Amino acid sequence: DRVKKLINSQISLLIGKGLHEFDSLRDPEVNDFRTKMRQFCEEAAAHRQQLGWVEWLQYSFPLQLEPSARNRALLVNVKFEGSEESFTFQVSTKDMPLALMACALRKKATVFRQPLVEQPEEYALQVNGRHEYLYGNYPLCHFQYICSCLHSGLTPHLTMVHSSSILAMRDEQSNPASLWSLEQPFSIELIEGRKVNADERMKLVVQAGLFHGNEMLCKTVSSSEVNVCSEPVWKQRLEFDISVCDLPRMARLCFALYAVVDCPIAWANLMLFDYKDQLKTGERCLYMWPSVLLNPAGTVRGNPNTESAAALVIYLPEVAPHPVYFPALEKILELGRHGERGRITEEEQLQLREILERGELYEHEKDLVWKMRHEVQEHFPEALARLLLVTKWNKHEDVAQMLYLLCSWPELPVLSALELLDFSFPDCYVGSFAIKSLRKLTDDELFQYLLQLVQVLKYESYLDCELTKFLLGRALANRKIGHFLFWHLRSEMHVPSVALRFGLIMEAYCRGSTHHMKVLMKQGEALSKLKALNDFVKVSSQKTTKPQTKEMMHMCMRQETYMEALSHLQSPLDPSTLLEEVCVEQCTFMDSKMKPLWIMYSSEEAGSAGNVGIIFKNGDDLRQDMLTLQMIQLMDVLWKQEGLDLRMTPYGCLPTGDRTGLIEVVLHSDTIANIQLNKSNMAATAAFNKDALLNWLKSKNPGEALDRAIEEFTLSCAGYCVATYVLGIGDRHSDNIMIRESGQLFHIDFGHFLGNRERVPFILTYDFVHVIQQGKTNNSEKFERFRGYCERAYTILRRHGLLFLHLFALMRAAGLPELSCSKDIQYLKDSLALGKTEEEALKHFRVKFNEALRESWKTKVN
């Protein structure tokens, strides 16, 4: 009672929408989702509270392993929980956590003078001051943390945590106690319009279309030209060239209101069948969306702003004296079960094999694929997507035959399934099949494609769908998936077209984890304080000097409310990272337009690893930066899987709200511009500006350490050269290129990509060529090693080109201005040269790299 009320108020606060607003809609679809998903999520919670302690570690602290894992001597520091005493010992990189734990237990038994009761099977290793653990049958070098410690030269710091301490964690965090006979053409009545705004010199026209995804089910139909006014009256029948029996389940009726002398005013879409498969009848008031002509990919829910929105009043006629439902799967299978099998020649079989292993088709090739659909199922099951595109979705008998084959179709690889989630495959059985083939995704693969799967939610026609249930069950079984599902949904609550669906998904999730809701509320409280702090800085910076604005910012941070809200939270960029004590004296802001905040933290328990920073940005849209950074991280994963480590810096970037988000601070790094300022009285002051970077690296890496710093520079430079080329990242200058003290180079501020439209050439800078060449004019041994790294990295990506295309195609749903149409994805097809052999593509890359070298020489000549 009292606790249910508190939880409801806490969910309302967290999701940024009062739960009463869901009830105020008196919508049965909203109500059924809330009830079904509350039940499904609470069952997930009860399953969790009973997990074994190692399974609970898999839930809460999923393993962070090196892509390769999916000899060498090592020093490790181990302490036991609650002890100020630690033990430093030598293990091998090939040793398993259990060997290290048994070594720590022998040390404790000798130091505490007792033959211990505890066995190493009773413990897990926590990374000090982090929500990260090392457990399982994996050598130590396979863990991201150990791998990171080895490369940086730092000593791993671990805590032996007993099964009883993990079980106390689990307990503390528990939840509190018949259509086919209807042959008449499809038709509607266009009654009237309301709240219409347009030039009175013009006329109003309503264009109407019937769609199955992106494809027209028949020709579009227009109303008559009526004079422009606030309340236009049509009262006319619009008839389509499609029988009511041929309407597919996922048929959408799309509208566009416009003014003619073309002038787009608004658009609205609706599904012809409801969420309970009933064919819609009666009057419908369609609260239209402003047009930026038909928009089939647009949401099928009305504009919530009923006070200002233009509205179309339509009538769906009563086609039968009884409710008509879409036929059940059993009746569809019955109809599709019958149909002649393909009996063709070996030559016509060779023409079919040529096109199925090939990508648009000619009409005769379509009729052949459809004829040979049984052979597609039995010998080319990965060509399901081609066959689905040749199916005539506007003929219920052809759809029945396709659906019969699909229900016996073998499970497809993850790559094929991601393609099948595209809006070009709108059928709910195709969608269900795609999800079934994605269930085999590992948590690491799911995490990698989470952003795209969340965007796919904007294509969903109904609230209760297989994709939401899949995403919810996977989020409730893995805290890190849960974390990022919440934030991707939360960051779009200011968008009216998704606020309902997203708010309901977050409510359902919260029912499944009360503790995690409170952890996320703490993150929201910090973000709330950061926004108020940033507004103060924006105002102050325009009136006083930077050291004055910085002092006032510190004073505001020093307030009890800010110190409490800003300290002891999980990072929204990484729930493994704990943001403990805010280091006020170290906090600052950037001189740029939006004045982003630089917030520093420290943790005594994590030591050096607890020294972390976050950038809070308000005023810019960070979605494209996040997508680019995720794509670079995917490149890094793919290269490491072929044994190529290009020493990339895929730092965190997370939109959290309306033009609001966080960026991970990469410590011990500076921009090329600051280094190239060539300031006097510094360790890097150069005779020639070209020496500055190398002198800076020399000062950070004394003696023998320079060699490895030049090598890290070369590797990351090859990785970023390929990544910016493939992704079309332009506007690259000295202030958006950074360098780490280790020698690693990385890119920041990714506002423009995919050539944005001017095709971006491969980029080579003489300042970077100089470091690669170890400060020598001619050093083709070092330069050509660099070109080899570029070529190897490029050819690895091309081999996974389809994965990038499928993910970028899913991202079209994001609404990013630079990722709107097929032209934007043409850029990625061209940069990866996928319509070529590896020989023709490598030849082409060599032409572009040599062209970039000749361009770079225009700077070398001087």
Ligand X SMILES: O=S(=O)(Nc1cc(-c2ccccc2)cnc1Cl)c1ccccc1
- Chain residues binding ligand X by CB under 6 A are 590, 592, 596, 615, 651, 663, 665-666, 669, 671, 735, 738, 748-749
CA–chain centroid gap for 775, Å, is 41
Give the separation between CA 549 and CA 591, rounded to whole angstroms. Answer: 11
> Residue 369 and residue 352: Cα distance in Å, rounded?
7
* 21-49 burial code (b ≥16 CB/10 A, e <16): ebeeeeeeebeebbeebeebbeebbeebe
Q: Are 425 and 434 in contact (CB under 8 A)?
A: yes
Between residues 324 and 663, which has the closer beta carbon with respect to ligand X? 663
Least distance from ligand X to the Cβ atom of residue 589, Å: 9
Minimal distance in Å, beta carbon 541 to ligand X? 13
Distance of closest approach, residue 816 Cβ to ligand X, in angstroms: 16
> Nearer to ligand X by C-beta: 669 or 685?
669
Q: What distance in Å separates the CA atoms of residue 685 and residue 240, rounded to the nearest whole number?
A: 76
**What minimum distance in Å lies between the beta carbon of 417 and ligand X?**
33
The Cα–Cα gap between 834 and 804 comes to 11
Minimum Å distance from CB 632 to ligand X? 12
- CB-based contacts of 30, cutoff 8 Å, min separation 6: 22, 463, 500, 504
Residue 41 to residue 513: CA distance in whole angstroms: 8
Indicate the residue among 118 and 735 with the shorter CB distance to ligand X: 735
Nearer to ligand X, 620 or 691 (CB): 620
Closer CB to ligand X, 152 or 308, in the complex: 152
* Residue 543, Cβ density class (10 Å: 0-12 exposed, 13-18 middle, ≥19 buried): exposed
Task: Report the relative pairing of strands 73-80 and 157-162 from DSSP bridges.
Answer: parallel
Beta strands 221-222; 282-287: pairing state:
unpaired
Residue 811 CB burial class (10 angstroms; 0-12, 13-18, ≥19):
buried
Residue 264 φ/ψ, nearest 5 degrees: -65, 130
- What tokens appear for 456 in the block? 């796919």
- Burial of residue 830, with CB atoms counted within 10 A of its CB: 0-12 exposed, 13-18 middle, 19 or more buried: middle
| Residue 767 beta carbon to ligand X: minimum distance, rounded to whole angstroms | 17
CB closer to ligand X, 294 vs 666: 666
Choose between 61 and 487: whose C-beta lies nearer to ligand X. 487
Q: How far is the CB of 737 from ligand X (least distance, A)?
A: 9
Q: Is 742 exposed, middle or buried (0-12, 13-18, 19+ CB in 10 A)?
A: buried
CA 446 from centre of chain: 10
Nearest to 52, CA basis, from 172, 163, 132, 159: 163
Q: Decide whether 15 or 748 has the Cβ nearer to ligand X.
A: 748
> Is the CB of 516 or the CB of 647 nearer to ligand X?
647
CB crowding 272-297: b at 16 or more within 10 Å, else e: bbeeeeebeeeebebbbbebebbbbb
CB of 673 to ligand X, least distance (A): 8
| Nearer to ligand X (CB atom), residue 642 or residue 735 | 735
User: In the complex, what is the shortest distance from the CB of residue 653 to ligand X, in angstroms, rounded to a whole number?
Assistant: 7
What is the rounded distance in angstroms from the CA atom of residue 386 to the CA atom of residue 377?
A: 11
Complex with ligand X: residue 485 or 665, whichever CB lies closer: 665
Least Cβ distance, residue 572 to ligand X (angstroms): 15
Closer CB to ligand X, 731 or 840, in the complex:
731
Count of other CB atoms within 10 angstroms of residue 50: 10
**From the CB of 595, what's the least distance to ligand X, in Å?**
9
Nearest distance in Å: CB 591, ligand X: 9
